[PDB]
Write a structure and sequence with these properties.
It is classed as membrane protein, cell adhesion. By secondary structure, this protein is α+β, with helices and mostly antiparallel strands. The chain is built from 16 helices and 26 strands. Strands 1, 2, 3, 6, 13, 14 and 15 form a seven-stranded mixed sheet that branches. Strands 17-26-25-20-21-22 form a six-stranded mixed sheet, with no helix packed on it. Strands 8-11-7-12 form a four-stranded mixed sheet. Helix 1 packs antiparallel against helix 12 and helix 7 crosses helix 8. The longest helix has 16 residues. The structure holds a molecule of 2 linked components (GLC-GLC). The site of a molecule of 2 linked components (GLC-GLC) has 12 residues, from helix 7. A molecule of 2 linked components (GLC-GLC) binds next to helix 7.
Length: 488
């Protein structure tokens, strides 16, 4: 439950919260109203959790993308500044916080990821992703690495994934098609494939997270990192001589970071809505208010026209804006939340080798355990496909095995005719099917199918497919019966 004569604010711990607290101190001096600034972990998830019982902060700071979901659920107060105030901020920043015709937050700043590079290691940073492996080998021989960035959050890997064609939700005449997701298409696969072979080639580590990449760059251990304007303060402190530049191209195309508008929403259960509007409108969104936050941790390109114009000469801000121009604004639709957890899981699963990129992105796109046909009929001379597939909770072992057995009709015993094991198909030269079996399976899609060519009358019998995918060293089986005809 929310008290009542004061303001509690949540903001991410990577942003200028001490600078925000100082604006809080000034508000408190003028008004006598206490302003507490907190930075809870995963506050983007904590907010809806507690705001559903009417709990949480009076005001929450996050990128605009999460606010559609908050608004849909009725967690945010409608924002109603007059036209005079609105005119103080860029119109596009207001569009980012409009949901279902209503303004539901105040925009603060435009963030995009950039390439950051150590000028003493790399006076001339690569223009291209494809250069990076060769660069890394050079730098490795000198006890350094080429690149480290946060691999745990899809925000950071998305620019590469989207570069050659990936998208979240298709944008089509004024609206997002929630049914048309582009995390599976050929472009997205190429981008994530490039990323996982950086890892498989030891140019990056699948475990690398935000703290590890920041520490490595700031200690001069790696030549480049990918991060937003909040990060620049920490590198200034370290003294590393850095530049901030355009992200490398991939297959000749710009990297495409998702652009965020840092925004401040007012809790619908806040008894302090007029005080919150006063703070944000009269204290935060002023040159001095934004300056105080910005000098703590850089904001990016601020929403407030006067101060954006003041800051716009900074070439690090120019680079941020150039990267944003090449990327695209995040949708603010409530589905964004599902999108992010889907791609997060796909990246981690692909980066660790639990899935191939195809498998991984299929699942993201979407977010009797053995199957054979019952009975197949063939003509003499024809070929028949003997489908076999399975479903499992396990990743695909490789060590995965498939075995086909055959039992002639009226016959006694089932004999092996085909075996897939340790990555290779073996036929059997014993076979009455020798030179007539064809492997058409693919263990990566949990498929063990074969084709029998040039059917004969005496091929009549029952085939059994047996699959082991080790965890899972217990054989699951299914049977298919073949009848061969002159015709029918
Ligand atoms: O990684 C998925 C995550 O990415 C975007 O979050 C950013 C946020 O915009 C930045 O301000 C910065 O703090 O880093 C975050 C990524 O770690 C989305 O805003 C967020 O909803 C999403 O879950």
């Amino acid at each position: 439950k929310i008290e009542e004569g004061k303001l509690v604010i949540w903001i991410n711990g990577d942003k200028g919260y001490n600078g925000l607290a100082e604006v809080g101190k000034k508000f408190e001096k003028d008004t006598g109203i206490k302003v507490t600034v907190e930075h809870p972990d995963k506050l983007e998830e904590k907010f809806p959790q507690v705001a559903a019982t009417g709990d949480g902060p009076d005001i929450i700071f996050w990128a605009h993308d999460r606010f559609g979901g908050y608004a849909q659920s009725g967690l945010l107060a409608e924002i109603t500044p007059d036209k005079a105030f609105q005119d103080k901020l860029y119109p596009f920043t207001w569009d980012a916080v409009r949901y279902n015709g209503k303004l539901i937050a105040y925009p603060i700043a435009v963030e995009a990821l950039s390439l950051i590079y150590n000028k003493d290691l790399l006076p001339n940073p690569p223009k291209t992703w494809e250069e990076i492996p060769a660069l890394d080998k050079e730098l490795k021989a000198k006890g350094k690495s080429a690149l480290m960035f946060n691999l745990q959050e899809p925000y950071f890997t998305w620019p590469l994934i989207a570069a050659d064609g990936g998208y979240a939700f298709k944008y089509e005449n004024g609206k997002y098609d929630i049914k048309d997701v582009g995390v599976d298409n050929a472009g997205a696969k190429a981008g994530l494939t490039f990323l996982v072979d950086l890892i498989k080639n030891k140019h990056m580590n699948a475990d690398t997270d935000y703290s590890i990449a920041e520490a490595a760059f700031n200690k001069g251990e790696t030549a480049m990192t990918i991060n937003g304007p909040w990060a620049w303060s920490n590198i200034d402190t370290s003294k590393v001589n850095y530049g901030v530049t355009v992200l490398p191209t991939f297959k000749g195309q710009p990297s495409k970071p998702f652009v965020g508008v840092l925004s401040a929403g007012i809790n619908a259960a806040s008894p302090n809505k007029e005080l919150a509007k006063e703070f944000l409108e009269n204290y935060l969104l002023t040159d001095e208010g934004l300056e105080a936050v910005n000098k703590d941790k850089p904001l990016g390109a601020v929403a407030l026209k006067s101060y954006e114009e003041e800051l716009a000469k900074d070439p690090r801000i120019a680079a941020t804006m150039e990267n944003a121009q090449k990327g695209e604004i995040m949708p603010n639709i409530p589905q964004m939340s599902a999108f992010w957890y889907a791609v997060r899981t796909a990246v981690i699963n692909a980066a660790s080798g639990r899935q191939t990129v195809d498998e991984a992105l299929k699942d993201a796109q979407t977010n009797i355990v053995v199957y054979t046909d019952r009975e197949v009929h063939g003509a003499v001379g024809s070929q028949v496909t003997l489908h076999c597939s399975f479903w499992s909770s396990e990743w695909v072992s490789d060590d995965i095995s498939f075995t086909w057995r055959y039992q002639p009709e009226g016959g006694r015993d089932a004999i092996s005719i085909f075996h897939y094991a340790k990555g290779q198909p073996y036929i059997d030269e014993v076979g009455t099917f020798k030179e007539r079996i064809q492997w058409v399976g693919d263990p990566r899609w949990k498929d063990g199918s074969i084709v029998i060519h040039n059917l004969d009358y005496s091929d009549n019998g029952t085939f059994t497919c047996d699959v082991k995918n080790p965890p899972d060293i217990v054989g699951k089986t299914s049977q298919v019966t073949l009848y061969v005809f002159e015709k029918v």
